[PDB]
Structures are given as C-alpha cells and as structure tokens.
Symmetry: C2
Subunit: 453 residues, 2 copies
C-alpha cells in the first residue's frame, strides 16, 4: 500500500462535500482504501509526505483534440472567427499529411507531449476527440493516441470523431475533408473490440464522437445511438456553438437539440461540448433527458462566442464537467488555469447578483466529479474508499500563495504556476516534486519538437 | 559586463517593434549596452546561456495594493460587489490594525512576499498605491514597502494615497482614515525628500496618488497638480469604476473627467487605473490631454465590472499600460497570467470583428513599454542601447510549450506556469533557474506566513 500522510487539505467531492485538514489517503493497487486522520501504515510499503499540500481527485479533461498540440500559437490563427479557424486547421493538417509530416507516428508524439503536460497539470484522465482520418482508409491515429496514453499511464477515453457531411449537402466542411459513414462505423466497431475496458478502473475506453450537427450526417448519429446501446459505450459531440442553430434551421427546420432528439441522442449516454447558446426553453429538456455538458471556457472566449449558461445548467440539475479543448484554440492543456478564466469571466454577465457567479468549489467540482460524470465514470472524481486512486496535489507553501485563507479558493485565485506537485493515476505515482517520475521529460520534448511540422 | 548569449527570441518593443532570433544582450552596470547578434565579450566578466529562452523588457505592474497580499482567498469576499468588497476590506484592515496585527512591520513582510512573487513572475518594476492610513498621523507604511523593495532589488514607485473626504462632511470615506489636505501634502514632500531618485535608472520614485474622485477633496487634487509640475513627479488615481459617475454627479454635478480637468489633472503627468466605463464622447478628450490608462482586467472581471474600452483607447492614441491591482481583488500578483485573461475576455464583445481583439503583442507591449510610459519612465520597458538593464526571460523548451509556432504568442496562450527563468533588474541578476539569487525564499515564506492575521 501507499500512504500519503499529513495533507494540509483534502477535498473529497463526496456526497456530503467533505473536506479534511491534516489528514491521510491510503491506496492499495488501483483503489483508495481510506481517507481520514492518522491512518494505519500497517501494510504500507511507501509513505509520502503530504504536509503543505492540498489533495483533490485527479482533474478530468472531458474534451481534448490532442493532434492540435502541433498547431499552437500560429500567427494567422491568433485572431480569427470559427469559419476561418476551422479552414485553417483542416487545410494545415491535410497539407502536412500530404507531405508525409502528419501520420500516426507524428500524432503519437504530439499526443505524448500534450498528455504529459496534462499529468503535470494534475489531470489524470483525458477524453480526446480525434476526427483527422485523411486518405482512403482510417489510419491508426486512435491507436497512436492510446499507445501514448498507455506509455504514460494516464487514464484515457478516445471519442472517435469524423466529418461525414460535406458542403455539397449543407455541411460547412469541404468534401475533401469528408469520410463515408460506413467507414466511420466499421472503424469504431473495431476500436471497441480491440481497446475498450468496460470494467471498473478501466484505463482505456472508447466513445463515439461525431464532430457535430453541421459536420455529420443524421445517419451517423443514428448508427452510433444503436452501437452505444449494443456495446454499452458513450456518445459525445459539440453542441450549440453560435452558428449551429442557423445551420440546422436551414437544412432541417429544427434546432440542434431537436435534431439530436430525433436521431437518438436525447439520453443519459451523452455528453455535449460547449453548449454556449441553447434556447432557454430547451434547458429543462436537457435535464429530463439526462445529457451532460462539458464547459469549455477558453475556446468559448477565444472564438468570441461568449458565456455558456452554466448557472442555469446547475440550477436545472444538469451534470456539468470541464475541458480545455484542443491546443489550436486554447492554446494550452492547462485545465486548472482555465478554471480561473471561468471564475472571472462569468461575473460581468450578472453584475448585481454575485450569488449567480460560479464559485471556486463549483468549478473544482466540474473539473473532477462533473467531468467523471460526463465520461460515465462513477469510479473517478471523488476521494473516498472504493474509488480509483487518481489523486492530484498542489503545494500551498510557495511565496505566491502567502496570505491565502482558503486553500481551495487559492488554487483558482492565486499563483504563478498550475503545476501539480504529486500526481497518482490508477495507484501509480507519476509526478513528484513537479517532475515526471517515469516519463523521460527531456527526451519527449526533444523527440516531439523534432516532429512538429 | 554581463552578456546574455544566444537568446532564442528577443522582443525589444523599440520604435520599429524589432525582434531578434538567436541574439545577445550586453549589459554594463545598470544599462543595456547592445542588443544584437554575436556581440563581443571583450569587456565581459560573466556570460549567461540564453539558448531556449525568450527575453522581454521586464514587466511593469502599474497598479498594486501590496498590503492586500494578507487578504487573499477569503471566503466571504470571493463573490461580492464593490460595496460589499470595500466594506469587507476596510473593516478587516481597521480591525486587524486596532488589534495590533497590522502595523508597518506586518506590511513590510507582506510587501516582501508579494514583491518577491512579482520578481518570480518577471516583473521588474511595481507601482504600489498603499491605501491604509488608520488614525490621525500616517505611520511608516510607505517606508515599510520601500524597505521591502530595496531589500529585494526590485524597482519601485510608491504612489502616496489618501481618503481626504470624510463620510460625515458629505463623502465616501470612513473618518478614521481622513487626513487634512496639508498633512497629506507634507508627508508627500517628506517622502520626495527622503526617497525620490529622479536620475535615470532611479530605483525608487514617489508619485501622488489620491484614491479617487469619490474619496478625496478637490483641494488635494489641485495641490498635487502643483507639486507634480514643480517636482516633476507623476499623478495617479482610480478612474471610471462603475458608480463613480453617479457619485461625482451627486457631489459636484459633473463627470469624474470634468472634475479632473477642473482640478488640474487633464495633463500628460497623469496615469489612471481601470477606466472601465467612461462616456465614449470623453475619450478624445483623454487623448488630447495626454493622460495614460492602466488596464486592470482581473479586478474588472472579479468585481463584475466588465471590459474597459481598450481598443478605443489604442485607436485614440492613448497610452495604455497594465497592472494587477491588489491581491484582495485578483487575488494574485501574476501580471503575465492576467494578460491571457485580457487576450480572451475581450473577444466576445466583438464577436464578428476579430481585428478589434487585443493581440498578444499589444498586450505584452502594455505590460512593458505601456506601463513604463504610465509611470513616466523613458528609461524602462524597451530592450535597446541606453535603457535600463531590466530583463525578464522565460524558457521555451518545456513540454507545455511544444508545438508553439510564435514564441511571443506562446507566452500568452500556452503553459502551466508563468514563472520566469532569468530576471535582471538594474543590471543585477535576481532570479536564475526560476529561483531567487539573493532572497531567502523559504525564510521569507515562513516569516510572512507567521504574520498573516
Ligand atoms: Zn472540440
Ligand atoms: Zn486600485
């Protein structure tokens, strides 16, 4: 067993919202044995000094696009609206691929860098949505991301994505960038069979993740609804980005939500990215259907889209998680940092009603238990006996956090660095003293840097 | 001389916005001798390896309230409007003071911690506006902040503040903080005598800094205007916070700007904090007067105030700098991190006009040359021969910055940490390898922590 002893603060996000001061966490293999004061070192082979740290459940990034790690801080994409951005991302990936610079071997190393950054930011589970499948067959991009995740020991969900609707039939995505529906469906069946670990504490899971209503055929949504039921997997897509409702109205005469409902996606199998601009009248329907929503504050601001109605979702009892999206519209993978953006940016929408503003604890819950719920993981996101030993800890004793009265608020509101001190995934210590203990950091940086087009 | 050799990127903010790749900076005493490729090491006693770093002028925080370092992450102040915030801050400061827990000795150590954090975040100059003068005579609070700054070697401007308008004599300030105008003027003259270093590369400067139009007598503004011209010092106050216009209309029957103009503050000696909600028709007047504005995105969002019209200011040719304000409304001193907040949060105000969005380079200029201009420092904020050797460098070769195409944009848009690698102030190396060279970090944390009420 591993004992983390004397943590200054432990935030459990359990059903009573318990927190503890000067307390311990005991781990046995993949699971937490106990969380409490003065735990027995009875059968402990290693004790870790937690004094001066705050411990949370590992952060869970419920929406990534890992391959975009190769597209950070491109000047031509710094200040662009969505149409220009998407064109720029699609054309660069296709161009680099055509030139032999962007195959699965490159994506493997880009994924490795972004996932290692994720671990260093206290993120223990990442859900990636990968849509890039150029050419005549679906190449081993998903396999590559899974290989990187497995090598690092980070918990991983792969939501296989696509664009199946071309401009010729109402999609805002060129035919060149379009895949046949049957090819997508066939590929997903194989991925589930090869990789999906449905058991508690499973380290790799597959989800079905169309890019969205403006990008994919209704037939794909229906195929995936059937596949999800048959194989007991989850469903993910983008939802209510600003131009979406215009597209669905024009093509189908209905809202994006009504479209999802018609095609089998109004269910508790589903988590939805962004959800920036739904009609208010649909919010109770999201709640009744049991869909979950991932708040992605950074891209919502970066694209000029604005503020998702997160308070309204919480009021309605809808599950709200958190994510970063990909590094071409963030442009980092720093989930903890992005929580600060949300804590501050929502406030001016309700200048005279601060009770509506999202609190630090609400945001930390979104990034842990909320994201776990988005991914369908009752085994994650909570520090309590029987849950996965996925733990992230930050030091509280730096000069940049002097004067902090509440350490949980301090995690969001103070600091020069979001680097986690100690990170455990599946009971394995992966980061200590802000440095990877198993991954070869310097080698990974060098190798991936050499491969960036 | 000191040579920093082989910097990967140098951003000068000189008159032609020059940048350099694989270049050097040569320093002699307090000044930059040269910036360019393959500089001679003929007169050099120390060479520092700059490979893998980006170098900027040191960041300049043009608006702080250092004493608020002791008031971070207080649950009762997490989500509050300004009225509640001000009451909570004033009540705590006065209460702690009355109980002997908040004298200049405590403020010295709080300042030391926040200023060390500042250095670690690449900030080489701070302008503090100390807002706490309990009782009749003003204690050595300013002296305490200056002592901390001088001990650390950070360049420092102290804007002497006040609340000269009593809440009784029709005002908005607790009478316990109300000093006679002549007492304030006298303290300022003494501070100038004792501390002001008007020569180029001066390390301590005094500014004259009323809290604001709702807080100070017109007589103080006029006295300060006279002093500014005669001593060649600068003038600083808060400007166009929400509700200020109503307060000014009630007290004086004119706008906050009209008030400043009437009392001598419509001049190029002035920099103004926040400037969130001016009447648009006054903006050309600000420009004609030559006043400068410090953008403070974090408190503007934290208080629910919203987005200052920064693009409008830039369009009008108004000098724009940047600051963090105090740690009771931030709640950190991380200027670089706050730039990212501004980069993103301004965008949804102009969803269809990305050319209006603030660029990374515009923001980095605000935090360097713009802030230098706010403070009246033509010797700072630019990496060029003859300017002060105030330099901040960040590493570009971490795993969290893999895939970055433009390092300047990357500094704003990526990363787990805003910690600077190498920091030089007045030609003195103060941070290397992210660690203080001279300051005892652990002792400072322990000592200051012990004194937080
Ligand atoms: Zn996405
Ligand atoms: Zn202020």
């Amino acid at each position: 067993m591993i004992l983390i002893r004397g943590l200054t603060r432990v935030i459990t996000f359990d059903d009573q919202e318990r927190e503890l001061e000067d307390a311990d966490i005991l781990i046995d293999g993949p699971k937490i044995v106990a969380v409490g004061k003065d735990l027995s070192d009875r059968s402990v082979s290693r004790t870790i000094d937690g004094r001066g740290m705050i411990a949370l459940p590992g952060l869970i990034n419920s929406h990534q696009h890992l391959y975009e790690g190769a597209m950070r801080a491109i000047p031509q994409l710094e200040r662009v609206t969505m149409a220009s951005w998407l064109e720029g991302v699609l054309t660069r990936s296709a161009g680099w691929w055509r030139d032999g610079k962007f195959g699965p071997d490159v994506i493997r190393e880009v994924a490795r860098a972004v996932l290692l950054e994720s671990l260093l930011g206290g993120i223990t589970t990442v859900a990636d949505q990968h849509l890039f499948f150029p050419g005549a067959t679906a190449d081993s991009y998903i396999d590559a991301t899974i290989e990187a995740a497995t090598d690092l020991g980070i918990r991983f969900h792969a939501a296989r994505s696509s664009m199946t609707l071309g401009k010729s039939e109402g999609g805002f995505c060129d035919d060149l960038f379009v895949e046949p529906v049957d090819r997508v469906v066939q590929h997903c069946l194989g991925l589930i069979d090869q990789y999906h670990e449905p058991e508690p504490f499973g380290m790799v899971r597959i989800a079905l993740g169309p890019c969205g209503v403006p990008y994919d055929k209704p037939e794909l949504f229906e195929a995936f609804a059937q596949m999800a039921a048959d194989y007991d997997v989850r469903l993910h897509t983008h939802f209510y980005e600003p131009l979406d409702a215009g597209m669905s109205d024009h093509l189908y005469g209905m809202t994006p939500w009504r479209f999802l409902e018609k095609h089998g996606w109004a269910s508790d199998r589903v988590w939805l990215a962004h959800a920036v601009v739904p009609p208010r009248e649909e919010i109770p329907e999201f709640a009744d259907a049991g869909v979950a929503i991932a708040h992605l504050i950074a891209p919502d601001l970066r694209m000029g889209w604005g503020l998702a109605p997160i308070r309204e979702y919480l009021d309605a009892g809808i599950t709200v998680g958190f994510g970063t999206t990909g590094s071409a519209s963030n442009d980092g993978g720093n989930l903890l940092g992005d929580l600060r953006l949300a804590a501050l940016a929502h406030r001016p929408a309700d200048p005279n009603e601060p009770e509506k503003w999202l609190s630090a604890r609400e945001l930390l819950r979104m990034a842990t238990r909320g994201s776990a719920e988005c991914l369908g993981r009752p085994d994650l996101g909570v520090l309590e006996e029987g849950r996965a030993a996925d733990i992230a800890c930050w030091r509280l004793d730096g000069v940049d956090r002097v004067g902090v009265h509440d350490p949980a608020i301090g995690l969001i509101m103070t600091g020069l660095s979001d680097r986690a001190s100690l990170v455990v995934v599946n009971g394995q210590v992966l980061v200590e003293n802000e440095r990877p203990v198993l991954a070869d950091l310097e080698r990974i940086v060098a190798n991936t840097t050499a491969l960036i087009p």
